[PDB]
Amino acid sequence: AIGTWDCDTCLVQNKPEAVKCVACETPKPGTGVKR
Ligand SMILES: [Zn+2]
């Protein structure tokens, strides 16, 4: 797993340290592959 993900619900990127997006606090689903 890369360990990094971007939030497309509000165009905001989050780093591995993040947990819940600041603008909308995304659940941060755990997915091995983004695609
Ligand atoms: Zn977001």
Neighbours of ion ligand 1 (CB under 5 A): 7, 10, 12, 21, 23-24, 26
- Ligand 1 center from residue 19 Cα (angstroms): 11
Secondary structure (DSSP) of the chain:
--S-EEETTTTEEE-TT--S-TTT-------S---
- Ligand 1 center from residue 3 Cα (angstroms): 17
CB neighbour class for 18 (10 Å; exposed up to 12, middle 13-18, buried from 19): middle
Instruction: Report how far residue 22's alpha carbon sits from residue 1's, in angstroms, rounded to the nearest whole number.
Output: 23
Q: Token digits for 24?
A: 């909308």
Instruction: Say if residues 6 and 14 touch (Cβ distance below 8 Å).
Output: yes
Method: NMR
Residue 7, beta-bridge partner list: 12
- Ligand 1 center from residue 13 Cα (angstroms): 7
Instruction: Say if residues 1 and 18 touch (Cβ distance below 8 Å).
Output: no
Residue-range domains of the chain with CATH: 1-28 (4.10.1060.10)
- Ligand 1 center from residue 28 Cα (angstroms): 9
